[PDB]
Structure formats: C-alpha cells, structure tokens
C-alpha cells in the first residue's frame, strides 16, 4: 500500500512514517536532511527533500509523487501580512492543492486523507477544518475517507507525545469499511 | 483494572465487554439475562442484571457497585413520557451514575466515556453538554472524560479501546464515528 | 397579531410583553399574581395565572390558550431533583407547549423564539438541539424558529426579539448571540 | 460618528452605506467608479476609489484613511491556487489587516468592527469566523466590540442587521447574527 506524508521530518511526521512503514511504502516529504537520511534507513521509506509550498503551489506538483497512480494514505503533517501568507499557504492551501493533485490516485485506491489540525492561528485552523469537511462531502461517493486529527491545549499541546498522533492515524486508517473516523480530538494529560 | 459498563447486553455493550475484559475486570450492567449469562463465561466478567434508571435514580445506587474503591473506566452505553424516558436514561443516569462513582474514579484517576426527531436532538446535545462540563469539574481531580459520537458495534469497541490506550501524557477527548457515506 | 410569552412576569418577560403589546394582543403566562395584575394594566395584554410545568406537561395544556385561532409570536422565557426541575422547565415545556400550539402557529406562519452547572450546560445545549430540530421539522409548514442566546438588561433581550420578528420579507433571523 | 465600509459599491455595500449615512460620515471604499459617483450623491458619503487588496496588503494602508483619529464603525463587506489566493486574500487577510491598521482609530472611539460572512468557500467562511472570534478576545479589554453577520442557505436586510448591531444598549453587545432566506 502507498502512503504520502508531509512534514515528515517534524516530531509527528517521524512517528507517522515509522508507523505506516509497517504496511505501506511511504513517501516522506520533509525539510530536515539528517532526519530524511535517518528516515531512509527504514525499509520501504522513500525520502523526498522538498520545499513543499514552492513545489505544491508554485510548480504544480512534487515530481517524485507524480508517478503514483494509487495513494492509500495521505497525511498532511506540514510583518503580519507575510505571516498570514506563510500560515495559510502551508496549513490550508497546500493540503487542499496537494490533495487535488493526488485526487486521481486517491480515488483509484479509495484512500484516506488525514489532516493534522493569535488571530492567524485561529483562522487557519478554522480554515483547515472547513476544508476537511467540504472535501469529505465532495469525495465520500468516490471511496475517499477524510479525517481530522485535532491536537490542542488542555496544558499546551506541545506536551502531547508525537507517537499518540501516529496511533491516532493508525486508528483512523484501520477502521472497517462501513465506517469513517472523521475526527479525533487529542489533548495533553 | 476495573471497568463498569452500562447497556452491556446491547450490541455495542457486548463488544465493549469482550474488548475491555482483555485487561479489566468488567462489571457489566444490562437488561438481558441470557446475554448476561453468556458474558459471565468471560474470565473476570461480573454480570449485574439491572433496571438502570430505577436503581441509579431512585434507589441511589447499583448494589454490586457499592464496595468498589477503584474504577478505572466507566462507559455509559445504556411523548412527554418519551421525553422522560430518553432524558432519564440518556443524561441523568450518566450524570448520576458518574457522581455516585466519583470517589472510586478519583481514587483510580479513571476515565469516563459517554457513547452519544426532537427528543433525539435534545438528548444528544444534552449528553454532549453534560460531558464537556463534567470534564471541567473533574479536570483537577485526575478524572478524564471522553465522548464517542456515532454503525458496526465493534467499531465502537475499537474506538473505546483507542481512547483508553492513550499514553501517560495524552488523552483522547472525542472521536466522531460516521457511516462510510 | 397574537402573542404568547412564558415567564412573562420575570425580568425579561415583562419587557418582552411591553414591546410586544405595541402591535400584538399578548397572552402573558406567569405565576406572580402581583406582576400579573401589574401587566394586565397594559392595553392588549391578557394575563394568565398558570403553574406551567403541571399544566403543559401533566395536564396536557394551558386552558386559556386552547382556543386561539393563531399565534404569530411564541416566546419561551419561562442533584436528581435539580435535574428534573430544570429539564422539565427549560426543555420539555418549550418542546411540549410548542407542539400543543402547533396548529395555531401553522395557521399564522408564526415565529417561535427560545431564549437560551453540569445541569446548566446540559439543558442549555438540549434547548439549542430542540430548537434546531424543531426548525427543520417545521420549516416546510410555514413556521420560523429562532434562538436568542444570551451569555444584560432585559430590555435588550426584548429588542433582540423585536429585531427578529420584524425581519424583512425574504429573511429569517435564526439566532442572535447576546453578551454583556 | 465615523464609519468605514469596504465593498461600498457592491449590492450590500450600497445599502449599508445609505443606512449608516443617517448618523455617520461614511468612508466608502470601492472600485466601481460609477457607483462611487452614484453614492457620492448621498450627503455624508466620502467615496474612495481603491484596489483594496493592493493598498491594504502591499502598500500598508488605504491613503485617504490615514487621517482618521477615531473610527466608530468599521464594516468589512468587500478551483485553483489562484482562486484560493484571491478569496483568502480578499476575505480574510484584508479584514484582519485593515482592522489592524485602524486599530488606533478604533480604540480611540471604542468602536465596533463588523464582519459580513466548494472547498474554498467553506474554508474561507470558517477562516473569517475564526479571525473574528480571536480578534474579539484580543481587543475586549481595549474597548472594541466585534460582531459577525453569518448569512446562510435583500441587501437592505443586511443593512438592518448591522444597524441592529451597532445600536445595541450600553450594557449589551451583539456578537453574532445568523441570517437565512
């Protein structure tokens, strides 16, 4: 089975790549070159060094993902004005447009798309959430499952072990066929 | 570990008891005596035949639950007259049954899981308010509160198993389960 | 125009009945006989002493409302023991009173407006779930449903109610969040 | 009083501008040069030709608004990567930045900001709402009121809702109004 994971070199993505590599060849898109090397030590992990906003939004797609004709699992773990653009580009537009570019392969595999969800932070997380829900409704008939795993504070969210996010992802994709786990709310203890 | 499950002879309840019995002694409260007998053949399963409204609301407690000093997991899976039936069973019973088990839950720092027409709407929102507010009240007392908001019965048991398997630093406060389409 | 207001003798009720009396005959339900007497002084206001839980729920009706041929505006402003009282009064009564007046509401294409600790959370969400579902059930039958969700001078609530029912021909105001 | 209204030449904008001109001088931003002249025929309306994304986002302010030391009422009424950028720029980033830029004038007047609320359309309407609700919390202590008008499945009726919002009592805020056909 085929998995694509963005933010693969962040704390969460590393744990997500290790989990999915049990039963998927994983395309792990990431920024950190040492983690990427470390990741390629895992069998069936295909590291892709990538500046994701530039590749997804400016160049029309990540070349090394272009040949995939079935994707089973796609996990999106990647002044003020410049700050708005940076956040919205990376947290909302890239998941939407990367999912669109992989759409044919997602339909073909009946895959699962999982999103990991100040004024700018509130807006983009509320944005990402409306994207997820409307996408889900657009694609349910095509066999695509859409899910949001939502970390947040109880205290602050950084105290969530990243492996628990990987487990949340594993729980979502493992759900039986008559089911969609559409949302999982995650908080520190 | 000690688990208390209501609605234990419903489809959901049966699969929840089968799964929780892997690592818990399970006090299974339900209506159907034959399923109760069946469940009792599961190592550790304590069947309690119960009319839950009456015992919990009027009698002030379920008898076979009174000498427990630890509860690690409590799962609530159990027209004017209809309103009274729904609201009594969907809301007050979970509120009141949690209250009565509060000491054993704090002592265990345990987990409370609530499995979520016009009566149907108000009860499900009512259950959701109860849970989120009970979470706030018992946050500092070491009790964790979780909703499963739903479908194949085992998928519910899986969701419960995922909730309580959370590590030492995390909790799963809600899981939405929907039909495929 | 005909109007029915519960908890009409509480702070909000009083102001709601005054404003509504400008263009409505108002049937004002209360238990304060002195405020009820007081209210009756206003033209167009016809007061009704009622033990509303007992009447709506246990006797299936409030007698003095039974004969109305339409209701243009209905406004709902009226421990285990604590669970029962609040749920009875905050949720079941508006559900049941509303059902009981269904034929008058349908006749007028009227407006139903609901004014929205563990108990307090639960009933306030129950009330909101009721209103939304009720809205969907009756949308096709001419009835408009609204909530006022105050999280305040009662006159402000009355103004919120007035703003809702006076809304244009093409528009419904389905919810208004009011804060201190 | 002083009002700033974006999208003044749009169908909503015109009726919001008319209603506000009763008790405000209205800075009415738009691109339509004929409708701007049309509106200029309403006394108390000082129209302002503008490419608002460019001026607010690139240039760091709308010129003809830089003099304002008080603003009472600010009203924001203005499937490809490019579509995403167009919509989110206009509907989210503009309102946050414009509000930020007028933040000194708004604090001085203790004024109110009103936001008038397909994968792109869901994402931006949720974004604006999240923008508005965090903004409100940020500025509550500084005396600014924040309100949303959330249309759903006649422009004058939007103008009326806005009038309802700004006219609220001394002790009361109207934070949100859900509107439907």
If you write DSSP's letter for every residue of D36-94 in order, what string do you get? HHHHTTSTTEEEEE--HHIIIIISSS-GGGTT-S--SEEEE----HHHHHHHHIIIIIH
CA atoms within a 13 Å half-sphere pointing along the CA-CB vector of D21? 18
CA distances to A96, A126, A157, D91, D97 from D120, in Å: 9, 13, 28, 11, 20
Do B and A touch (≥3 CB pairs < 8 Å)? yes
Among D164, D169, D180, select the one facing C174 at the smallest CB separation.
Answer: D180
Alpha-carbon Rg for chain D, nearest whole angstrom, is 15
Per-residue burial over A97-108, b if 16 or more Cβ lie within 10 Å, else e, is bbbbbbbebbbb
Residue A5 phi, psi (nearest 5):
-135, 120
The two tokens of residue C43 are 């033209």
| Integer Cα distance of B133 and A66 in angstroms | 48
Count: domains in chain D: 1
Cβ neighbour number for residue C99 with a 10 Å cutoff: 15
Using DSSP bridges, classify how beta strands B170-179 and A179-188 pair: parallel, antiparallel or unpaired: antiparallel
Of C180, C1, C32, nearest to C14 (Cα)?
A: C32
DSSP conformation class of B169: T
Contact D159, D105 (CB under 8 A): no
Find chains touching chain B: ≥3 CB pairs under 8 Å: A, C
Contact C176, D177 (CB under 8 A): yes
| Integer Cα distance of D1 and A25 in angstroms | 64
Of C7, C20, C96, nearest to C59 (Cα)?
A: C96
- Write the CB contacts of C78 (distance below 8 Å, at least 6 apart in sequence): C6, C7, C10, C13, C29, C52, C89, C93
Among C83, C95, C124, select the one facing B118 at the smallest CB separation.
Answer: C95
Dihedral, CA of residue A134, residue A138, residue A139 and residue A145, to nearest 10: 20
The two tokens of residue C124 are 């306030």
Contact A179, B180 (CB under 8 A): yes
The two tokens of residue D166 are 């700004």
| Integer Cα distance of B93 and B80 in angstroms | 18
| Integer Cα distance of B125 and C20 in angstroms | 31
| Integer Cα distance of D152 and D125 in angstroms | 11
A141 DSSP β-pair partners:
none
| Integer Cα distance of A49 and B9 in angstroms | 53
CA distances to A12, A59, A62, A96, D140 from A28, in Å: 12, 19, 12, 18, 44
Q: Where are the beta strands (DSSP E) in chain B?
A: 2-5, 25-30, 45-49, 73-76, 111-115, 144-149, 170-179
| Integer Cα distance of A1 and A95 in angstroms | 21
- Write the CB contacts of B171 (distance below 8 Å, at least 6 apart in sequence): A154, A186, A187, A188, A189, B144, B146, B163
Of A126, A91, A81, A129, nearest to D130 (Cα)?
A: A126
- What does this entry list as its resolution, in Å? 2.4
Among A123, A125, A134, select the one facing D119 at the smallest CB separation.
Answer: A134
CA distances to C162, D26, D110 from C146, in Å: 12, 32, 30
Q: In which domain, by residue range, is B172 found? A: 1-181
**CB-based contact B170 A188, cutoff 8 Å:** yes
Query: Which own/partner contact pairs does C102-106 have at CB distance under 8 Å and 24+ positions apart?
Result: C102/C138, C104/C2, C104/C68, C104/C69, C104/C70, C104/C71, C105/C70, C105/C71, C105/C74, C105/C138, C105/C143, C106/C138, C106/C141, C106/C142, C106/C143
Cβ neighbour number for residue A41 with a 10 Å cutoff: 8
- On whether any CB of chain B is under 8 Å from the CB of A146, the answer is no
Of C174, C148, C144, C168, nearest to C159 (Cα)?
A: C148
Instruction: Return the ∠ at Cα C168 (arms to C165 and C170), rounded to 5°.
Output: 120
Return the CATH number at A137.
Answer: 3.40.50.720
Return the sign of the alpha-carbon dihedral for residues C45, C46, C49, C53.
negative
Helices (DSSP H) in A6-161: which residue ranges? 11-20, 33-40, 52-53, 80-88, 94-109, 119-139
DSSP conformation class of B91: I
| Integer Cα distance of D80 and A93 in angstroms | 10
CA atoms within a 13 Å half-sphere pointing along the CA-CB vector of D46? 10
Alpha-carbon Rg for chain A, nearest whole angstrom, is 16
Find chains touching chain D: ≥3 CB pairs under 8 Å: A, C
| SS3 state of residue A110 | coil
**CB-based contact A186 B177, cutoff 8 Å:** no
Nearest CA in chain A to B142: A189
The two tokens of residue D76 are 């924001």
DSSP conformation class of A33: H
């Amino acid at each position: 089975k085929i998995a694509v994971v963005t933010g693969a070199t962040g704390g969460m993505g590393i744990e997500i790549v290790k989990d999915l590599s049990r039963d998927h060849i994983v395309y792990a898109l990431g920024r950190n070159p040492e983690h990427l090397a470390a990741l390629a030590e895992i069998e069936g992990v295909e590291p892709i060094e990538s500046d994701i906003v530039k590749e997804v939004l400016e160049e029309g797609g990540v070349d090394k993902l272009k040949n995939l004709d079935h994707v089973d699992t796609l996990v999106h773990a990647a002044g003020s004005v410049a700050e708005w653009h940076a956040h919205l580009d990376l947290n909302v537009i890239v998941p939407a447009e990367l999912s669109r570019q992989l759409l044919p392969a997602l339909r073909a595999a009946s895959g699962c798309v999982i999103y990991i969800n100040n004024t700018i932070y509130a807006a983009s997380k509320h944005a990402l959430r409306g994207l997820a829900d409307a996408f889900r409704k657009e694609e349910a008939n095509n066999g695509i499952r859409v899910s949001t795993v939502s970390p947040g504070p109880t205290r602050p969210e950084i105290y969530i072990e990243p492996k628990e996010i990987a487990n949340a992802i594993r729980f979502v994709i493992d759900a039986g066929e008559t089911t969609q786990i559409t949302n999982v709310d995650v908080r520190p203890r």
